Amino acid sequence: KETALSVGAQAGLAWRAKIIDEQLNKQARNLDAIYDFNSLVLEHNILPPVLLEGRNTLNLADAQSIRISDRTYKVAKQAHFITTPPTWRQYLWMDYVKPEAPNVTLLPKTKAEKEIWCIYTERGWKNGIDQANTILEENIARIKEDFGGMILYRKLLAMNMVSPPYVSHTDLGVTGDGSEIHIDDRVLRITALPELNVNSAEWRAAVAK
């Protein structure tokens, strides 16, 4: 019965996951080539924050009530320190196990149950294919979202729309008692989280050629 359908879903999803992990390992160097996080890092080893845009917004509230806007922008996540640039593997890699145990309960001994077992397993297999590809494209959308956010911050910082983050280095010389010492002690902090400006007269345009 439908047990064959369920295990067909599991087997198809797992096998397509295996093939797509194989393909993502097959094409390797162009991926981290194209997704360079490490050039996006600022001066003080700080990940730039993520920005989002929107063109030509209109929302109707109710009768006699609408609200339009030309362009919108939103800060998603603030900037912070990072001990390492990320990679794409925590955005694109997917897990893998083997669905391994059809219990010896539903085994077809007649031709009719044999073929309905076959077709139910087959449509489960196709369903698993579809579910795996849906998972992949959701991951694709997420990593494109984050890359677009940081590149939008770089564009606006060029545009003079956002103040850059401001740092402080408090230096201390020797410190500690006669048991413990550090040679020099530097404390690095950031203070001004980057945000949009509102003085439109300071917004600088740009015209190419």
Binding site: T3, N103, V104, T105, L106
Partner: protein
């Protein structure tokens, strides 16, 4: 929240016969509960063309809790209350014992009696005297029923009986 009287499946591994009630267990294999298990004993039927298993102690893993649902079993794909066992068990032995004892009694009495109209008399001797005691013992033990036994490797289906929280 398990709905009342639904369908799951389980597996029996330990075997015991329909003579001595005691601990037997199954383990739920599909459906919602996986790795859950259920202990109990059996039932006694007056006619041995069906056999059912009295299962009461249902344990779900993870927590130290034990729910109070008592349910029975059915065979998968056949949906019959009979057990996979043999039912031709105890006809031939008692039938042959009774008929042989009676034949012995008859041989002794009639072949002594019809002598009017040594070793032949010894045949009369043997069947004459071993017919009677074997006959009364056969009439003593003839009433023993046919047995069935649960199988040590036969899977099962489960209808539920009550609900839980």
């Amino acid at each position: 929240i398990i709905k009342t009287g639904d369908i799951m499946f389980a597996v029996l591994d330990t075997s015991v016969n329909s003579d001595e009630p005691g601990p037997i267990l199954a383990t739920i294999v599909t459906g919602k509960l996986k790795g859950s298990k259920l202990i109990g004993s059996f039932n006694l039927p007056s006619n041995a063309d069906k056999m059912v298993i009295t299962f009461n102690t249902m344990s779900i893993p993870g927590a130290e809790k034990t729910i109070s649902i008592s349910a029975y079993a059915i065979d998968p794909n056949t949906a019959r209350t009979a057990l996979a066992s043999r039912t031709n068990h105890h006809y031939l032995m008692r039938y042959g014992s009774l008929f042989a004892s009676s034949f012995l009694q008859g041989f002794g009495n009639a072949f002594q009696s019809a002598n009017t109209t040594s070793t032949l008399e010894n045949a009369v001797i043997g069947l004459a005297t071993v017919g009677k005691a074997w006959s009364q013992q056969a009439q003593q033990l003839f009433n023993t029923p046919t047995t069935v036994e649960v199988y040590s490797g036969t899977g099962l289906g489960i209808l539920f009986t009550q609900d839980v929280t």
